[PDB]
Ligand binder design. Structure first.
Ligand code: PQ5
Ligand code: NA
Length: 329
């Protein structure tokens, strides 16, 4: 009907349980508890003239694409022909109006004192400020933060398999490209399921979990389509995105532009292969595992992931990798 007050999405008990879990130029992310269940709350200032975290705020029209994409991908958990739970669940979206809640400022301050923030303290917003508030499934901790915490390369294999299957299902259903799948955008949480289920073009299969559920996040650069209407971020005139250095991540932006001839509206699912390659490279070169490959069977998984790294760039999509690559047989 119109924007709601913060206390609509965050009644006092929910607000009092908020702890800050992450941040970016976009704003802030909190974990809280609703009906005994953790959820993640992402809060983005929109439509105002103030710089926030050094950048202008998005308009409603600029933020809408990523909300639409979020929802489409979340909806794949309930589909039939192309079904996956490997994208973050989206529970609700609200437009809220007001100054920033003092209880969230307390949470922001605690994070700043313990971990340090790159952001502005969000205490300067007036009572007319608009925000989008997204409530997500709680996805756990990002892969970059788990650099030293995973059990073994068996776990790495599960994570790669989960990511490849989820991307394949989204290619098949939505002609999806993530386009920014760095290791801060892969979330890991514990699961008691021994195996995870997906369906790709009507064929169902399973993935051993190694006790982890992967969730893909962050759709600001993503592209998909339904009945020929394409939702995508046109970065064709962006300069900075293609001039980064110091990590293979920044090559991937350039490699995508090469692949698509700088036409971001087109469908090039090879971009998903490029991100999976980047992720595999991180698994082999930056991750460090609690148990190394000390037995024949583990040394074989290491060799298969090494083979994946050397061969996967000859595949045309995540779908091609899932269906044809020997790693997943
Ligand atoms: O943009 C989205 O699609 C997005 C969706 C879900 C979450 C965050 C998102 O963006 C902000 C990313 O930066 C925070 C990093 N860490 C964590 C940790 C745990 N969760 N659980 C959900 C999210 C989350 N983020
Ligand atoms: Na999910």
């Amino acid at each position: 009907k119109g924007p709601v007050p913060f206390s609509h999405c965050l009644p006092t008990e929910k607000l009092q349980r908020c702890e800050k879990i992450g941040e970016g130029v976009f704003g802030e992310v909190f974990q809280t508890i609703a009906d005994h269940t953790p959820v993640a709350i992402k809060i983005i200032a929109i439509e105002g003239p103030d710089l926030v975290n050094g950048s202008h705020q998005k308009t409603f029209e600029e933020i809408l694409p990523e909300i639409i994409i979020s929802k489409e991908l979340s909806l794949l958990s309930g589909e039939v022909c192309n079904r996956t739970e490997g994208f973050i669940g989206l529970n609700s979206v609200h437009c809220v109006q007001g100054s920033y809640p003092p209880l969230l400022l307390k949470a922001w301050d605690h994070y700043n004192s313990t971990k340090g923030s790159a952001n502005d303290r969000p205490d300067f917003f007036k009572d007319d400020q608009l925000f989008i508030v997204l409530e997500f499934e709680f996805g756990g901790i990002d892969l970059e933060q788990m650099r030293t915490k995973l059990s073994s390369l068996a776990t790495a294999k599960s994570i790669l398999h989960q990511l490849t299957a989820s991307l394949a299902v989204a290619e098949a259903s939505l002609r999806f490209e993530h386009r920014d799948l760095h290791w801060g955008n892969v979330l890991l949480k514990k699961t008691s399921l021994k195996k995870l289920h997906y369906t790709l073009n009507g064929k169902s299969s399973t993935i051993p979990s190694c006790g982890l559920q992967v969730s893909i996040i962050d759709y600001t650069l993503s592209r998909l389509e339904r009945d020929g209407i394409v939702v995508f971020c046109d970065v064709s005139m962006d300069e900075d995105l293609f001039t980064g250095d110091g990590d293979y991540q920044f090559d991937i932006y350039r490699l995508m532009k090469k692949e698509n001839n700088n036409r971001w509206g087109e469908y090039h699912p090879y971009s998903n292969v490029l991100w999976l390659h980047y992720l595999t490279d991180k698994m082999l070169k930056q991750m460090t595992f609690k148990t190394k490959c000390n037995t024949p069977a583990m040394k074989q998984i290491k060799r298969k992931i090494q083979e994946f790294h050397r061969t996967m760039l000859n595949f045309s999509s995540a779908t091609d990798l899932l269906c044809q690559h020997s790693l997943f047989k």
